[PDB]
Write a protein that binds this ligand. Structure first.
Ligand SMILES: Nc1nnc(Cc2ccc(Cl)cc2)o1
Ligand SMILES: [Cl-]
Length: 402
């Protein structure tokens, strides 16, 4: 029947907790986070006097600039102290006190592009061979072969970077929120990976500064300010960046398909917040690897029940089905993962309603198609402004044209 009526209005904007496809890393080829951050910072020499290039319409833009200058200034202090401290509590300046707090939207093309990027392979690997699972006992042979096949396909996947990025920053923020309750602690955004050649590498995405965090319960909120490197010029797609003040903070010399080029380096700045319970879920994002592995195993066990033999080799080596719609078994694994990871990155009540209610309508349209009102309101009451939900609604309407 009817396609879901998606809402008209200004394009939807980014609302993840940290940048996704736009992130930029300052890296070192190799664990106290602040020390890692500083060594990453000193690898870059194209810093310059920072200025606003895309203002935050609803924010106090001078304060965001003062805040970044303060970060560089207090890191400059840390460098002079003979012993680099374990943590750095920021001076409680007026700009930080302000920053720390002491409507229908249409679907924009950028969220589909984010998703596509999350399915891509990266040069580096983001997990260990035995990252997936938490068994007490040794795992049996068929389970081990399935985990090693699936692990080979998603260890280099971009969405796995997003998982480990997310795990690190939520663990550091949750820890700081009870170890340094009254401090405006400077918290590096770090990840770790292993290069194509097997070299261990440490990545700095930027920094967050947390506010006062007396989190008596799970829904209590701690505010923070994120400051994230990027090469994305925000002026190309300003609607994506409604929540940010974007600074130009340097220039970077790059290898490119035309040889060496200098590109501006930007800093995406926004205020944000999270709660205890959201930080605990952030710490469990590696579950996305486990849950999507199980969706794969649910498929192999279905095929194996038909063919009265184990079909793990035949499934993963793509050796009954004569192809793979997404292209390869590897792409299916990475699409499942990326969906699971984006469910985590863009979790919301709107996503919850859309999933459970659109599920009911799918079975009804499938049973109708095979053999041949109130659900629509429940579904469309969830189509408000969340980019991930709007995309999934758009995907659902494709399934409704075939
Ligand atoms: N740790 C650290 N703090 N600042 C820097 C580098 C720098 C150099 C020049 C300018 Cl204009 C700004 C920052 O490194
Ligand atoms: Cl796990």
């Amino acid at each position: 029947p009817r396609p879901l009526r998606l809402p008209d209005g200004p394009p939807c904007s980014q609302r993840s907790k940290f940048l996704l496809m736009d992130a930029l890393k300052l890296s070192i080829e190799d664990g106290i986070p602040l020390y890692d951050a500083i060594k990453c910072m000193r690898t870059f020499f194209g810093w310059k006097e920072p200025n606003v290039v895309k203002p935050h319409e609803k924010g106090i833009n001078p304060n965001y600039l003062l805040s970044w200058k303060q970060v560089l200034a207090e890191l400059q202090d840390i460098e002079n102290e003979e012993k680099i401290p374990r943590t750095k509590n920021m001076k409680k300046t007026s700009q930080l006190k302000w920053a720390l707090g002491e409507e229908l939207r249409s679907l924009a093309s950028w969220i589909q592009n984010e998703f596509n990027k999350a399915c891509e392979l990266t040069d580096s690997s983001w997990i260990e061979l035995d990252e997936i699972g938490e068994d007490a006992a040794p795992i049996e042979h068929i389970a081990s072969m399935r985990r090693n096949y699936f692990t080979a396909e998603v260890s280099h996947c971009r969405a796995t970077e997003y998982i480990m990025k997310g795990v690190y920053i939520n663990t550091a923020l949750l820890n700081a929120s009870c170890a340094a309750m009254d401090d405006f602690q400077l918290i590096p955004m770090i990840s770790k990976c292993r290069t194509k050649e097997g070299r261990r590498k440490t990545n700095l995405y930027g920094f967050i500064i947390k506010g006062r965090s007396h989190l008596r319960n799970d829904t209590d909120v701690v505010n923070f300010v994120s400051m994230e490197f990027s090469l994305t010029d925000p002026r190309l797609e300003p609607h994506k960046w409604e929540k940010y003040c974007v600074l130009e903070v340097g220039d970077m010399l790059l290898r490119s398909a035309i040889g060496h080029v200098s590109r501006p380096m930007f800093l995406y700045v926004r205020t944000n917040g999270t709660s205890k319970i959201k930080m605990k879920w952030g710490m469990e994002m590696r579950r996305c690897l486990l849950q999507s592995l199980q969706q794969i195993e649910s498929m192999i066990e279905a095929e194996s029940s038909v063919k009265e033999k184990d079909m793990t080799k035949e499934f993963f080596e793509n050796k009954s089905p004569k192809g793979v719609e997404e292209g390869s078994i590897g792409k299916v694994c990475r699409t499942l993962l990326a969906k699971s990871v984006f469910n985590s990155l863009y979790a919301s009540p709107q996503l919850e309603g859309f999933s459970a209610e659109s599920r009911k309508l799918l079975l009804i349209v499938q049973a109708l198609r095979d053999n041949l009102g109130g659900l629509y309101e429940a579904i469309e009451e969830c189509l408000i402004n969340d980019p991930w939900v709007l995309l999934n609604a758009s995907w659902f309407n494709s399934f409704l044209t075939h």
